[PDB]
Amino acid sequence: CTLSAEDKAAVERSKMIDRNLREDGEKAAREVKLLLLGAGESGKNTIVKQMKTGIVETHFTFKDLHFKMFDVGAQRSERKKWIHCFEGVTAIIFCVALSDYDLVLAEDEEMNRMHASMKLFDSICNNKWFTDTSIILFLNKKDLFEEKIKKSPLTICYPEYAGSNTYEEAAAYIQCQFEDLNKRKDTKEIYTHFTCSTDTKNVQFVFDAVTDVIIKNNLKDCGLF
Template structure:
C-alpha cells in the first residue's frame, strides 16, 4: 500500500513538473514577436532592419563591420562605373568636362571588369580617380538625371567620403553601414528585446527570384512591416526593365495583405524614401505612373494618393497601419518603431483576451 502511495505521489510530482514546464514555455512563447520585413527589391527594408538593430541595442559584430567594409568598396565602384557607362547613352548624352576624367574613368572600369578590388584596402589611386570624376560637372549632371537610369540612392554620399575609405585602418561608421547596399539573399534573422517582448525579425530578399522562399516564414507571424518606395514611381525593376517598380510593389502588397496566412496578422505599411520622393516630385510628375493623378496637386496630396492606392488593396475591414518613412534617418525610424511596438502590444493583448 505504501509503495502504491509513494508511486502515486512521484507521478503527481512528475506531472506537476511537466505542467509547470509547459506553462513556462507557453508564457515564454507569448513573449515572442515574429516580425517579417517584406517588400520589393530596393524598397529600403534592409536599411530598416539595420536601424531596428541599432535602436534596440543589437550592435554589429566586429566581423560584420569588416564585412561591410568590402561592401562599401564595391558600392563606390559600382556607382561610379554605372555613371561612366550611362553618360553617353542618355538623351541628350553627357560627356566629361575635364580632359583628365577619361583616364580616371578607364581606371575605374578596368578595376570593375577585372574584379581587382582588395577587400582589406581601397587603393589610393582608385580613391583619387573617384574624387576627380566627382569633381567633373558632367558626372554630377549625370547623377542629377538618375531618374533616367538605375543608380544607388547613396551614390553621392560614397563619392564624398571616398578619401576616408582609402585609409589603411578604415572601419565603417554606423552611417556607412546604413547607407551601403547589398542585395538580401535568402532569409536574415535578427533577435532583440523591446519592452519585455522578444522580437524575432526576418529580413527576406525582395527580388522576384527570392520571393518563392518567403513561404517558409509565413507561419505564426505576429506582424509584417511592408516597405514600399515612394520614389519608385518612375523606375523599373532591375530584374525586368519592362515592369514599373511601383506597380510591382502594389501587386506584391495586394498578395501579402490578402494572404490567408495573415488574416490575424498586423500589417504595417512603410511608404519609404519620402525625402527622395519630395525632391523628385518637383521634377518628375506622378502622372507618369498614375495618369489619373492631377500634377497640380501638392506633394502631401501625392503621398496621400499613393497611400490610398496601397490601402484600398487590403481586404475590407482590415486595418493597415501606415507611416511615411525615411529609412536612413534613425530618429524617424525610432519614432515610427515606438508606434509599431505599441500596435503589436495592443494586438497581442486583444488576442490573449479573445483566445
C-alpha cells in the same frame, strides 16, 4: 508497478524533458513575432539599421518586450510552399520605396517598381493565411521623393492622378491607393508610417501597432471584439 528500474529512470528522464519543453514554450510564447517583406531593396537595410543564406532573424527588445523579426529576402522560390509557416505572426511589416515610380524594374524593362510593389501587397494582404494578421506599411525615402517630385510628375506612374504635383497630396494618394487594395477591411487594419526619420520613431510606431494588435486579440478572446 510492473516497471523495471531502468524503465522508471527513463520515465523520470521523459518527465525532465517535458519540464524543459514547457519552460521553453512559455519562454517563447511571450515574444512578439514580426514578418518583414519588401520589393527588392526598398527600405530593408534602413529599417534594420534603424533598430540598432535564407531566412534572417533579428532580436531586439523595447520596453520589456522582445521582438522576433524575420526577413525572407533572397528566397527565389514559390511563396505558397512556405508562406503557411508564418500563420501565427503578430504583424507583417511591409516596406515600399516612395522614390521608385520613375524607375524601371531593372531586370525587366518597361515595368514600374510601384506596380510590382502593389501586386506584392495585394497578394500578401488577401492571402488565406493572413486573414486576421495586421499589416504595418512603411514608406521609405520621403526626402528623395520630395526632391524628385519637382521635375517628374506622378502621372507617369498613375495616369489617373488629378491632383497637385507636390509632396503632401501625392503621398496621400499613394497611401490611399495602397490602402484600397485591402479586401478584408472588417477583420484587419493597415498602419502607414513615413519612415525617413533619423530619430528613433519607427521602433515606437512598431511598438504602438503591436500593442493595438494585442489589445484587439485579447478583446476577441474575451468576446468583446
